Amino acid sequence: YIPDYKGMEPIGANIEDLVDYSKDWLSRARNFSFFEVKGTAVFECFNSNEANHCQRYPMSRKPRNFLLIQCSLITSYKPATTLSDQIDSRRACSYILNLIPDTPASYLIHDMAYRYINLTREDMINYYAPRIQFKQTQNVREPGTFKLTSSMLRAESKAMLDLLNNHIESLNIASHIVQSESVSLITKILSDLELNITDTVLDKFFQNETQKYLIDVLKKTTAWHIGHLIRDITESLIAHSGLKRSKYWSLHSYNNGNVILFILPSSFIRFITVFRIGPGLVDKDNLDTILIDGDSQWGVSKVMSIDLNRLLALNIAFEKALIATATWFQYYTEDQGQFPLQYAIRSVFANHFLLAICQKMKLCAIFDNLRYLIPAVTSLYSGFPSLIEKLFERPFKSSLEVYIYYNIKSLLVALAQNNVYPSFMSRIVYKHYRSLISEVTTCFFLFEKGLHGNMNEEAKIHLETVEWALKFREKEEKYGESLVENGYMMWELRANAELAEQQLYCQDAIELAAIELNKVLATKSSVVANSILSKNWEEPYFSQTRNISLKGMSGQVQEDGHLSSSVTIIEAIRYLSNSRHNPSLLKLYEETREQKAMARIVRKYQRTEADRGFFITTLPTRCRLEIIEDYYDAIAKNISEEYISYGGEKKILAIQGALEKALRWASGESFIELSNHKFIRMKRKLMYVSADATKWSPGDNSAKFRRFTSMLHNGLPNNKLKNCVIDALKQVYKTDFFMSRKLRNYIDSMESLDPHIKQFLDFFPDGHHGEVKGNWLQGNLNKCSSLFGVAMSLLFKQVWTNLFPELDCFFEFAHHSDDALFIYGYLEPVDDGTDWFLFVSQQIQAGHLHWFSVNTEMWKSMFNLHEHILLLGSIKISPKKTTVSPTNAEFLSTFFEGCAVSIPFVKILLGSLSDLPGLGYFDDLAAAQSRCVKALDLGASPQVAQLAVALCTSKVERLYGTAPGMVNHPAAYLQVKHTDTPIPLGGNGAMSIMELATAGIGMSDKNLLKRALLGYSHKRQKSMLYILGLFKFLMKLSDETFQHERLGQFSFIGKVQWKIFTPKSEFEFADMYTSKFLELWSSQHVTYDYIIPKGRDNLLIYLVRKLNDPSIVTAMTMQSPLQLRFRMQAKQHMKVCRLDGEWVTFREVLAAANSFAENYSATSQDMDLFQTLTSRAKVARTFTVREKDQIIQNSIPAVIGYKFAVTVEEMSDVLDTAKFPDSLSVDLKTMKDGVYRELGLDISLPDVMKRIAPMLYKSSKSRVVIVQGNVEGTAEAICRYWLKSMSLVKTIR
């Protein structure tokens, strides 16, 4: 059923009126929006911005600190142990007590060292004892800490403490003295960092290329050992960051007592570093003091306060620097065709390490802006003045920022003078522009995303939203609400000419654009109608994975008056609780039609991986947006070969057609008839423009689509669905935008209300929310906007064709996500342009005044009219990030960069070192290895991905203590090797990227079980039976059934259960059903392990069970500070493993596994279960692990659900889910035959199907792999491509 919603009637829109307006508009002189790129122009922009910046800021003569931890190293650093720590602390404090303090901080250092020396022997025993063996003492109350009362502190120490616990300017970068000082300091630090301090077939290539040219070179550097030392220091800081430990004092010593860390009763943790002065990370002007004891100097730093996100960023600084340097290494070999020299790789490593330890928002913003500044200076025209001006929007405080700014200025001026690409990080020169882009991309990704969302970048977006809303209100008060909403008419533009601004649109332009797009959509009416009707407007709303996800959503207006920040699954459960049925999309929109749209900014502590953007809106708003996007994504799929690229085969046809037509047209000559048969010859040239035209803007108007969808051709016999889309667009026009409690508190805290804060407060008249109109607040209207922009560009093309019929001008365009490429083919006179100007003057004298624009620089007038016609639809081309050039170098990269597939592998490699789920050793290892495999899929070299695998595995083993020589090393408690140990029991797996990418992450355990079976059943080996017993023990510990919504890693042969984070308050509705009820329901409903229920009651039970999943609770509280600190804590000595209904350490689980495996005897059922359980140009080829039989027409989850469907509700849900419900037994027979063919198993036998169905479910899924060449879509072709890419420099075919 579809209601009868009112639509719109076609007004009288004539293309001739717009053509006449364009004639009148082009008859005058129009300013071009972009500036010609010249080295002098860029230099003068930098100089003027320096002069302006230094006069509007308070000048400082003392740069601020940029090194969180200052230290030095002259000898190779041996990693810290508990025994060496005590010896180093004793000798270091003996050194320190022989010093004469002169500052309050140095006095505090002396006092703490004196207290440490005067601790008793039991104090020493309990200080270094594990929490299990720890005993409280009158001086030591927590392990690793000691008590320091105010009696033992001196007057200076007490004064320092009182100052600490009882708590903008810029540097003169225009001056050469500040420049020289900053450059000299950073150059000295970098030079100290670079100073040298005192098998598988892939392994051959690794040890010949990456080990020899990368690892063996950086392994001797000072930065390597400082990275390991900083890892030790940050581990000590993390250990002290515990809830019970942070209230006491701590003292640690590293590098034979040469470095000492003093930790204060710290949220932010406070510490002081005292070190021996030497080569390393030393900034003597930002040190608290330097104490002299003869020929030795000891630098004492200030009290440094650091939070957990920066502490995590500093802990993995060495790994991040090494991964970035390996990426730079791979890109260098791709560019130059050989290996980097030693000095270049050492300098790059030092720069990456310095960037990794200095995590500041200013550096992140600088490296983000550089990514747009580099294209702006390598093109003929761009908006480089604005981008350069953006570099000066924040003060320059530290010397690192000045150094980076000066290097950027030098690089940009050099690039602008060159229209051979200079490198930003070394003395090399690149042959390709992509390498220079990738350098700054890798540098930008070195900065964590945890420093984003601070309490300035949320106020920024609040103010931006409110400012645009107030500008919208001004235009409503000026022209009237009707003109602003319904648009203005063409005769009003011809009389005002101020009406053609952003947030305003012309009705006639919208209708004409819709007509122009109908010209091409009318040849595929049936296809468009079928694509629209295939969106399943009658399918239940909450049975879709996008409507029950973990993405953020707005909740309800609370009693205090604020908008809740909830999850889209909790709101689904809340709706279904009060609803007797599961409504469809249109029925849900009917029910929630009269509820006003609401929006707020997502809380940074409640963000998830599924969250995109900053705004979260209520359920009715998402329903309306989903209606509009189903409709528009259905219509826009039918021009996918022409103007918009989506993915797969039709991901490249748009640009291919556009550029090939441009090249075909340009390879010709034009002839214009001035008089008689005497013609004038013209040379055809091409101009390329890249603009983020489709990108969401806060200053847009959503009402412009209402007349668009009203006039657009959909091929359906009635307007009912079209009118529903119009009405849903009408219901998202006005929104209640709410502030955050954080912003309200921050504004209430300040005493001086700024003039720009007063107006922001007046926007909110009740202090909670204000009305926003026109803007849809980052709501998903991407395909609607892309289609609207395509229609507007087609309207411009028609208008230009009607303007100059005798001129054979050219215009093509393509869209990809927010990016758009426009190609203008213009004419230039051959030889000297005398006949051309004479003809233009004759045309103007004849009354064709619009020929004034086409006189010189035809492409500029083409772009001017295109931009004006786009602005008639409230589309503003960005004057900053739009790039114009006669060739396409920044345009074949920016166009596709922005997709879910063109993401650089740098981000994935650098994110495999953090954000681990914390679900256990096996789950964390699998997550890290899967992230490395994904990075390999995205373009990482096998050697780079292998290095990342090694780094991530070492980090996980260190975290859980399973590395050799550690507490939980499996070989110390099991009678097998470390390679014959199951991954859940502390093993490490294949540890080969080429086998993790092809076979899988958990196939190592299956291979081990295969070896154990084939050894025991053939030779009756005792050790093979021991391995069988270990696997049986793992199966006994935890044997879970596969749920397709679980976010963890599935283990086929058992797992160890680990303690997870317990939030302070459990999620709402999570206690609706008891765990016993959910366990029974899951046992008796095996179909709903592969499909989502369609009924209301079954979907409630399904969603409440999903809410109680430990891998979902973990992902919903991913950014919580408590979980974030819980993941950092070392699980080496913690009782976090489940055994016999009790929480025990991991080595107790290993001892129990050994005991079970010794006294284990194999049975026929066990043997049967074990046998069942063991059975050039960059493109984006998508492959499948084992592919699907052509006879299989339905989806694998649907066939498995049909296999397990028993209840009438389950069978109905399976038939609704299946795309071809009639041919379901035919697919089940085919799958039964295929399983017997390949696996040799019969699924009709009990428990065989339940065990092997997850394998088929994974095999159903497909992956996207970036391959460089003629690689086909088969898995074999991609495997051979990866084997060919095993060598960085030489082909190994």
Side-chain angles (χ1 to χ4, degrees), residues 1037-1051:
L1037 282 185
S1038 170
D1039 209 23
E1040 274 186 345
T1041 303
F1042 169 76
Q1043 180 66 42
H1044 70 121
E1045 294 293 328
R1046 293 181 184 271
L1047 290 182
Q1049 183 63 254
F1050 183 64
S1051 193

Side-chain angles (χ1 to χ4, degrees), residues 605-872:
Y605 284 158
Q606 303 196 18
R607 290 193 55 97
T608 58
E609 191 202 329
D611 271 327
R612 270 73 172 175
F614 266 111
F615 298 93
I616 55 169
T617 60
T618 54
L619 175 71
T621 301
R622 206 157 289 185
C623 184
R624 309 181 186 118
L625 293 172
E626 282 182 3
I627 288 185
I628 307 157
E629 293 293 328
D630 281 355
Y631 187 79
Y632 271 94
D633 178 76
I635 310 183
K637 273 171 156 49
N638 307 123
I639 62 169
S640 179
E641 189 177 1
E642 294 178 353
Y643 300 107
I644 321 171
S645 72
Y646 297 152
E649 305 80 12
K650 289 184 176 184
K651 201 199 175 194
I652 208 172
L653 316 176
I655 58 163
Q656 280 193 358
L659 305 149
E660 292 296 328
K661 293 187 286 185
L663 298 185
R664 193 154 73 251
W665 176 91
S667 62
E669 289 275 356
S670 296
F671 309 106
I672 65 183
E673 327 177 13
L674 188 156
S675 65
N676 303 359
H677 197 271
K678 182 170 184 174
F679 304 147
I680 308 167
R681 192 171 91 151
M682 295 296 172
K683 171 189 170 56
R684 298 180 171 180
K685 305 187 62 55
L686 296 171
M687 206 63 189
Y688 305 75
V689 184
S690 80
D692 62 357
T694 303
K695 176 166 280 173
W696 170 83
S697 174
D700 209 346
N701 200 333
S702 61
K704 69 193 187 181
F705 301 133
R706 306 218 281 261
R707 182 63 60 85
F708 186 68
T709 179
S710 171
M711 187 66 204
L712 197 71
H713 172 93
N714 57 4
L716 294 165
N718 48 26
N719 295 337
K720 291 174 71 175
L721 198 60
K722 157 178 306 188
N723 294 0
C724 289
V725 180
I726 296 170
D727 189 73
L729 270 158
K730 199 167 316 179
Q731 300 299 317
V732 293
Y733 187 61
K734 306 173 187 178
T735 302
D736 277 337
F737 181 63
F738 285 72
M739 293 182 286
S740 298
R741 291 179 178 89
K742 184 151 100 163
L743 183 63
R744 182 74 269 179
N745 297 347
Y746 170 68
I747 295 179
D748 282 356
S749 81
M750 65 184 73
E751 304 147 354
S752 167
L753 282 197
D754 302 328
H756 66 92
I757 300 296
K758 180 70 176 177
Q759 184 191 36
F760 174 87
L761 294 174
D762 316 322
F763 181 78
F764 304 93
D766 59 354
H768 310 306
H769 71 270
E771 184 173 274
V772 177
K773 305 166 69 173
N775 191 24
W776 53 93
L777 297 159
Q778 289 180 356
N780 199 16
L781 289 186
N782 291 131
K783 297 300 173 186
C784 184
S785 312
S786 194
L787 206 65
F788 180 81
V790 165
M792 278 288 153
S793 299
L794 289 178
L795 174 61
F796 150 73
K797 181 175 186 19
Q798 189 61 37
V799 169
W800 190 264
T801 304
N802 294 20
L803 281 187
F804 303 100
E806 54 268 16
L807 262 49
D808 63 358
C809 302
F810 172 84
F811 172 63
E812 286 292 314
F813 65 100
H815 286 230
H816 177 257
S817 286
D818 304 336
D819 309 283
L821 177 71
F822 311 130
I823 314 162
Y824 306 93
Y826 59 100
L827 305 179
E828 185 175 0
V830 73
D831 303 356
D832 201 357
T834 299
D835 292 330
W836 173 236
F837 300 155
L838 171 72
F839 179 61
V840 169
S841 185
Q842 270 156 45
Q843 294 286 66
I844 295 182
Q845 296 168 358
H848 292 171
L849 283 72
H850 61 292
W851 282 69
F852 161 88
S853 44
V854 65
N855 199 19
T856 60
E857 287 165 338
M858 185 180 288
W859 65 270
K860 284 189 177 186
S861 296
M862 282 177 87
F863 178 80
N864 285 357
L865 194 69
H866 190 192
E867 194 193 33
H868 189 69
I869 293 185
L870 284 175
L871 193 62
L872 298 190

Side-chain angles (χ1 to χ4, degrees), residues 353-616:
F353 185 63
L354 194 58
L355 287 186
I357 59 166
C358 302
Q359 300 282 275
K360 280 73 176 175
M361 188 60 228
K362 173 78 176 164
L363 287 185
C364 180
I366 286 171
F367 279 102
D368 188 34
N369 195 12
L370 193 56
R371 284 192 303 170
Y372 304 111
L373 271 158
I374 289 191
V377 296
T378 52
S379 62
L380 183 63
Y381 287 83
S382 55
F384 64 93
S386 297
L387 295 176
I388 291 168
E389 209 185 41
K390 294 173 40 61
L391 292 164
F392 299 82
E393 85 181 23
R394 287 172 220 211
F396 294 92
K397 296 184 183 297
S398 64
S399 282
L400 188 53
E401 303 168 1
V402 178
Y403 173 83
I404 295 282
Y405 162 73
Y406 154 82
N407 296 115
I408 278 178
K409 179 173 177 181
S410 301
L411 166 79
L412 290 190
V413 173
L415 281 183
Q417 276 163 359
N418 282 3
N419 63 358
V420 182
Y421 294 84
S423 160
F424 179 67
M425 293 177 70
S426 51
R427 296 294 86 193
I428 62 170
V429 182
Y430 285 119
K431 317 183 183 170
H432 301 278
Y433 158 92
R434 54 163 167 87
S435 305
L436 178 56
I437 290 290
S438 60
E439 278 193 350
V440 309
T441 304
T442 306
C443 284
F444 164 72
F445 278 122
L446 269 179
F447 298 96
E448 294 293 328
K449 53 177 185 295
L451 56 87
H452 303 122
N454 49 319
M455 187 66 204
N456 189 8
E457 187 205 275
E458 196 194 31
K460 182 178 183 292
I461 192 165
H462 279 88
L463 277 296
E464 186 178 2
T465 306
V466 164
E467 183 178 1
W468 280 109
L470 291 169
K471 270 189 286 203
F472 196 99
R473 296 186 180 180
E474 296 167 11
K475 303 177 190 184
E476 299 209 287
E477 293 179 353
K478 190 166 208 313
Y479 306 112
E481 287 193 350
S482 175
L483 181 150
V484 183
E485 186 182 11
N486 307 104
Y488 58 85
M489 303 292 308
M490 187 66 204
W491 66 264
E492 296 178 353
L493 190 60
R494 276 192 149 282
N496 198 340
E498 304 268 322
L499 268 186
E501 59 199 314
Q502 194 176 4
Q503 292 181 343
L504 292 175
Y505 68 95
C506 197
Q507 318 184 16
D508 299 321
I510 310 308
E511 183 179 1
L512 285 181
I515 289 166
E516 296 295 330
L517 193 55
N518 285 349
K519 292 181 181 179
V520 65
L521 275 174
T523 73
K524 48 191 57 175
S525 312
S526 303
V527 191
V528 176
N530 281 338
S531 179
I532 292 178
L533 295 180
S534 66
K535 283 292 181 180
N536 298 347
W537 306 86
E538 65 183 1
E539 199 259 359
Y541 181 84
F542 299 101
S543 304
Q544 324 185 22
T545 68
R546 63 175 181 175
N547 297 131
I548 52 170
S549 59
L550 297 188
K551 180 188 168 187
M553 182 174 288
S554 290
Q556 324 195 291
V557 173
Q558 305 286 49
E559 168 67 8
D560 66 64
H562 265 279
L563 206 55
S564 296
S565 188
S566 190
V567 191
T568 181
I569 180 176
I570 300 169
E571 302 302 323
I573 304 173
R574 173 180 282 109
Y575 179 95
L576 291 168
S577 297
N578 308 119
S579 181
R580 296 295 86 193
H581 62 267
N582 186 8
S584 60
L585 183 67
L586 303 182
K587 178 59 162 301
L588 180 67
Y589 164 67
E590 293 179 354
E591 295 177 6
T592 61
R593 190 191 101 96
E594 325 279 2
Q595 299 185 28
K596 195 166 180 186
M598 281 161 192
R600 77 178 301 280
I601 305 279
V602 60
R603 209 174 310 182
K604 67 182 291 294
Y605 284 158
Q606 303 196 18
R607 290 193 55 97
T608 58
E609 191 202 329
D611 271 327
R612 270 73 172 175
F614 266 111
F615 298 93
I616 55 169

Side-chain angles (χ1 to χ4, degrees), residues 258-303:
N258 288 317
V259 194
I260 313 96
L261 178 73
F262 302 84
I263 297 169
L264 276 76
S266 306
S267 69
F268 287 58
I269 176 165
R270 300 133 68 215
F271 63 95
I272 301 173
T273 305
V274 179
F275 52 95
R276 203 187 300 266
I277 299 287
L281 293 171
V282 180
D283 180 10
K284 294 186 185 183
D285 291 331
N286 280 290
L287 282 173
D288 188 62
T289 185
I290 295 186
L291 303 179
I292 297 89
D293 50 311
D295 287 344
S296 296
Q297 279 183 339
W298 291 82
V300 182
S301 81
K302 289 168 193 149
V303 180

Side-chain angles (χ1 to χ4, degrees), residues 829-1070:
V830 73
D831 303 356
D832 201 357
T834 299
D835 292 330
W836 173 236
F837 300 155
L838 171 72
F839 179 61
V840 169
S841 185
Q842 270 156 45
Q843 294 286 66
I844 295 182
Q845 296 168 358
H848 292 171
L849 283 72
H850 61 292
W851 282 69
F852 161 88
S853 44
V854 65
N855 199 19
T856 60
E857 287 165 338
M858 185 180 288
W859 65 270
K860 284 189 177 186
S861 296
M862 282 177 87
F863 178 80
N864 285 357
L865 194 69
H866 190 192
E867 194 193 33
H868 189 69
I869 293 185
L870 284 175
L871 193 62
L872 298 190
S874 190
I875 304 166
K876 183 163 158 296
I877 298 303
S878 185
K880 314 182 186 308
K881 298 179 183 176
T882 302
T883 299
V884 187
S885 67
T887 187
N888 49 4
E890 310 82 50
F891 304 161
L892 268 294
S893 56
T894 305
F895 194 84
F896 271 109
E897 264 287 349
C899 197
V901 184
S902 66
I903 190 167
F905 60 91
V906 176
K907 186 204 278 187
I908 319 295
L909 286 184
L910 286 173
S912 57
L913 303 154
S914 48
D915 283 335
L916 294 180
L919 287 177
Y921 169 72
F922 168 82
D923 308 65
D924 285 2
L925 187 72
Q929 278 172 348
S930 74
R931 296 201 188 105
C932 302
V933 167
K934 186 178 166 28
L936 173 75
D937 285 0
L938 291 169
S941 199
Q943 304 186 33
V944 180
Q946 184 64 67
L947 179 70
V949 165
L951 294 178
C952 296
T953 309
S954 309
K955 195 189 158 48
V956 173
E957 290 193 307
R958 223 185 301 119
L959 172 59
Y960 288 98
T962 63
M966 283 182 107
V967 176
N968 305 313
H969 186 54
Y973 317 86
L974 296 174
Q975 304 182 12
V976 298
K977 293 186 286 185
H978 193 224
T979 68
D980 288 358
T981 302
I983 308 176
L985 281 177
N988 64 7
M991 275 294 297
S992 180
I993 192 73
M994 302 306 294
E995 183 178 1
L996 296 166
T998 57
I1001 310 293
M1003 185 64 72
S1004 178
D1005 279 304
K1006 288 186 173 178
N1007 288 334
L1008 178 53
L1009 187 53
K1010 292 181 181 180
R1011 294 206 309 269
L1013 285 162
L1014 271 59
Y1016 178 73
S1017 68
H1018 299 132
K1019 296 183 290 294
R1020 250 49 179 194
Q1021 303 195 252
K1022 197 71 180 294
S1023 44
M1024 282 300 111
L1025 182 69
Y1026 183 91
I1027 302 181
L1028 291 176
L1030 286 175
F1031 278 108
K1032 183 73 173 168
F1033 173 81
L1034 280 171
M1035 296 210 81
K1036 182 174 72 68
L1037 282 185
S1038 170
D1039 209 23
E1040 274 186 345
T1041 303
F1042 169 76
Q1043 180 66 42
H1044 70 121
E1045 294 293 328
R1046 293 181 184 271
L1047 290 182
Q1049 183 63 254
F1050 183 64
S1051 193
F1052 284 75
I1053 309 143
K1055 218 161 57 176
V1056 175
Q1057 176 173 345
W1058 292 78
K1059 192 186 295 185
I1060 71 157
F1061 182 40
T1062 292
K1064 292 181 181 179
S1065 63
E1066 193 61 31
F1067 292 102
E1068 196 181 1
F1069 306 116

